[PDB]
Design a protein around this ligand. Structure first.
Ligand SMILES: *[C@](=O)([C]([C][C][C][N]C([N])=[N])[N]C(=O)[C]1[C][C]([O])[C]N1C([C])=O)C1=NC2=C([C]=[C][C]=[C]2)S1
Ligand SMILES: [Ca+2]
Length: 223
């Protein structure tokens, strides 16, 4: 997260870190046994880390649970990142508490202009590299589909939306993928991609979760 601020220990209880010997992507807890992340974050041997703040220090509120299965969206396209979403099941149910909580799925898609909270342990510099150990936060509005497609002509599908500021300086970045975009108490986006980080006229692109609620509910119910 570039241009954001330190969230505060466990102020984002649904935020999870996907670990394969090191943090490689973020994710969102949707219930005690399931996590939502980006399809491009898929890999074998994933360990979900909940209740984290400083990912390099065991502070006392974390729960490390191995994934038992991963399900990449049936229409995921690794080249264009269309349908960039995946489900990860925990080998054992997480113990839900105030610092480890699930985030609700959308009932309807959010409108442009709606303010959202984007979070992650990604790079904090737009022209360099500096990874934070504590969770970073960023308030960002959903941009019109017009400004989104204008910035990325021919690259935006109906399964993506842009959020951020066209002026640049504030945005998600590498290390944030798979992470949450929460608006009005619901998971509306998943950190997906973008042109560089926090660059003017190049806002962050996020998977549009509202288009997948049906798939998520049916998939988790059958697995
Ligand atoms: C993700 O943390 C980043 C998030 C980038 C957010 N960008 C924005 N908000 N301006 N995404 C990657 O860097 C993606 C994935 C690839 O398809 C290409 N790239 C683009 C164009 O954004 C990460 N994803 C990966 C990382 C490391 C290795 C593989 C995927 S970090
Ligand atoms: Ca920790």
């Amino acid at each position: 997260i570039v241009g954001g601020y330190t969230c505060g220990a466990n102020t984002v209880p649904y935020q999870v870190s996907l670990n394969s010997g090191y943090h490689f992507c973020g994710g969102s807890l949707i219930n005690s046994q399931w996590v939502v992340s980006a399809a491009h974050c898929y890999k074998s041997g994933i360990q979900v880390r909940l209740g984290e703040d400083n990912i390099n220090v065991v502070e006392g509120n974390e729960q490390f649970i191995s994934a038992s299965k991963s399900i990449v969206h049936p229409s995921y396209n690794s080249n264009t990142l269309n349908n960039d979403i995946m489900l990860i099941k925990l080998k054992s149910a997480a113990s839900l508490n105030s610092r480890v909580a699930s985030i609700s799925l959308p009932t309807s898609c959010a409108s442009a202009g709606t303010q959202c909270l984007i979070s992650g342990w990604g790079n904090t510099k737009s022209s360099g590299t500096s990874y934070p150990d504590v969770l970073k936060c960023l308030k960002a509005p959903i941009l019109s589909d017009s400004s989104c497609k204008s910035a990325y002509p021919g690259q935006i599908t109906s399964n993506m939306f842009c959020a951020g500021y066209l002026e640049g300086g504030k945005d998600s970045c590498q290390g944030d993928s798979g992470g949450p975009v929460v608006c009005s108490g619901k998971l509306q986006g998943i950190v997906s991609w973008g042109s560089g980080c926090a660059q003017k006229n190049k806002p962050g692109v996020y998977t549009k979760v509202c288009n997948y609620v049906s798939w998520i509910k049916q998939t988790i119910a059958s697995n």
